[PDB]
From a paper:
CtfAB then transfers the CoA from acetoacetyl-CoA to acetate to reform an acetyl-CoA and produce acetoacetate. CtfAB is a member of family 1 CoA transferases. CtfB contains the acetyl-CoA binding site and the PS01724 signature sequence which includes the catalytic glutamate residue (E46) sandwiched between two short antiparallel beta strands on the N-terminal end of an eight-stranded mixed beta sheet. CtfA contains the acetate binding site and the PS01723 signature sequence.
Author numbering:
A (entry chain D), B (entry chain A): 1 to 213
C (entry chain B), D (entry chain C): 2 to 215
Write the structure that this text describes.
Amino acid sequence: MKVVDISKINELVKEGATLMIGGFLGVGTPENIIDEIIRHNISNLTVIANDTAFEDRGIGKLVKNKLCKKVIVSHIGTNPETQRQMIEGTLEVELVPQGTLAERIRAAGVGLGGILTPTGVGTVVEKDKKVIEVEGKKYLLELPIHADVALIKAKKADYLGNLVYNLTAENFNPIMALAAKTVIAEVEEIVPTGTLSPNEIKTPGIIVDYIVT
Amino acid sequence: MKVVDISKINELVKEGATLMIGGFLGVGTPENIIDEIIRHNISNLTVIANDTAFEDRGIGKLVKNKLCKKVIVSHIGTNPETQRQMIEGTLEVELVPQGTLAERIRAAGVGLGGILTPTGVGTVVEKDKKVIEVEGKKYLLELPIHADVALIKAKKADYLGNLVYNLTAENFNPIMALAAKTVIAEVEEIVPTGTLSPNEIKTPGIIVDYIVT
Amino acid sequence: NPKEKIAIRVAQELKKGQLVNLGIGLPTLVANYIPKDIHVFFQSDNGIIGMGPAPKEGYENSDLTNAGASYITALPGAMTFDSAFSFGIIRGGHLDVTVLGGLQVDEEGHLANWMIPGKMIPGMGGAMDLVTGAKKVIVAMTHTAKGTPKIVKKCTLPLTSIRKVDLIVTELAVIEPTDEGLLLKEISKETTLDEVLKLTEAKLIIADDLKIFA
Amino acid sequence: NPKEKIAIRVAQELKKGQLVNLGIGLPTLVANYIPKDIHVFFQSDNGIIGMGPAPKEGYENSDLTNAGASYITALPGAMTFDSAFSFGIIRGGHLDVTVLGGLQVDEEGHLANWMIPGKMIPGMGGAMDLVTGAKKVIVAMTHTAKGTPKIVKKCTLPLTSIRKVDLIVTELAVIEPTDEGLLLKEISKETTLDEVLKLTEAKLIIADDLKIFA
Ligand SMILES: [Cl-]
Ligand SMILES: [Cl-]
Ligand SMILES: [Cl-]
Ligand SMILES: [Mg+2]
Ligand SMILES: [Mg+2]
Ligand SMILES: [Mg+2]
């Protein structure tokens, strides 16, 4: 059975895990899963996400509690504590253009070896990237990003674990669901099979390993 | 002013156009647009699609009337006349692994310069592909496919041109919508704005240039 | 009967809760022999998880077919989707099993199943993506082509993939490709080891525990 | 007033039915100045087409925000989507206009707008994708930073992109980068041609067509 108690997080997320965590500045983020990680000081984490939200919310709470060794994100500007720890050298930060982050994660999810993007060409992002010329235009070769566990948020799941999302809470969640080895979805409601139409489901239950509340 | 009469195909689909046409063996294919093309004998087409359907249906009717100079497809085995024309040398056929076709069309749609895929490595599909190794593994660099017009099929459009699809009629249609310069959608029903929820729309009206029926 | 023999034995390989893709033709018969206690989920390349059997007359939907455009049903909890998402499931490792037909399989476990030069050019469709990507590939094919062995030392027909398939099931034999070569694991109750060897051009390692079955 | 002057003039550049993305801060003021006969559609990076204004008190939804996590509304016919689709609209050339803020713009039309070394390190977010992919990029920015020209010969701050932006709008000037360099097309009614040039370190080509406006 996919649905498990939230208290089981300390058994599924290990010290030093590489995690994808959904959410856009805390919107569509698994707030209850993050609270469990803080409850049990699961530390030395590498967190892949759009951002580190704010000091008081979402992924920001993990940084507040110094549980991350590394973040791979497109933005940190709204979290002064992420900047503090970056400057001190305690937290490694890999900044990634948001559209490249989406496609690098997706590439792992759909089994690609990489994608070429014009974004970042001729900027500091080009550093340590292979450049490939196609039709005289230059592209950066950007590589798939993998993770041990995806921690995602969704609006509802049906009995079979099919997920739907709600408005701008979707953002990175369905992409991370395809990219990680183990997928744990925090959802707001469990609904009967047949409540979520085949035309509307966005993540099929087959790829969701665990569901909390 | 997106909704136009079917006769406007002749201003929009030029002789010798490169076209993406939706449909999986004729399911989710814009049958009425195809009939108008045949009516005005618009020829020398290059058609990018999953297949050439069957002789009496969908894209297969274009081939029966010899309106195609080239097809870029994953499958032609249900259409003996496509095969016949291929052998006689009158029709150029480029066979693309179905998943590679999906990602090459998508690459054009989302602004990527190419994608790396393990599919086809060490087969004839490797011929005239750059090979790229990433962490020891080999991938074929597969390149974006572009087209002048996407001729897609959808179940419903709202007044603003937002689209939804129905079951296995979706297949390549929403991908092609993003990839071609001009997008023409054949729809079964026009519905009021507010009938299609923000959570269920799959193709936004902004990228749909014209609607028929 | 030979096709039933293969489909029954392949169906016994499926496990509860697996996502399974059955190729058109012989592999599709596998759906008729799933044990009552095994619930799997079927995926089709045209874009569905949760495929069900052909509808009763009058219950067809024009938008709901299999990868041959024949009418199917969708089961409760099915999801339909675009072709990029379909091949993301396949190429990205989310499909537990694919059962595919076969023209040849060779000592390296390489499958040739999409083209016969000069005689049959249907294109590859999803076959190369499925062989490259499925967590487990099972080939289901008759042992010979009117006497010519289809299990050969090195394929002479064009390869679908350089991926090593995980299992071959014919009406005579069950063979598991391994790093040492082809391991013959089982033979049909209706054949003999001498017949299987006479009809297999490839080298076969023979298992200590050779079983009768299919 | 200068931010108003810019936003009003940028708003005049927008055409009916365009898909528009406004960056956080100065560019978001543009929305307040759209002519009543111009209907545009706003896109936000976090995954919406059809964004509307902040909701009246009590009509907030926790799942519906702009790219700064502030509550927004969604207008009839909006579509929400994941971040891959979002950056497919942006990078794939489906975004008609983006209006972004600016740290420097140079004679090549290159924008620096995401980092000041040794001070602000917020990361780039979607800014690199937007500048690279928008059909048209409009930079909306004050002409100087406490007197120091921000329109320079070559950016010294980190580039957002090597793409040539299409229009610069300051409280003093409207400048169009071209193959020949920067073309000064308009100046504020409240300034003079000499003041503009004095406050621009970059070489400006003065148009025969020169207009007053913003
Ligand atoms: Cl039925
Ligand atoms: Cl309101
Ligand atoms: Cl003057
Ligand atoms: Mg267009
Ligand atoms: Mg013997
Ligand atoms: Mg022998």
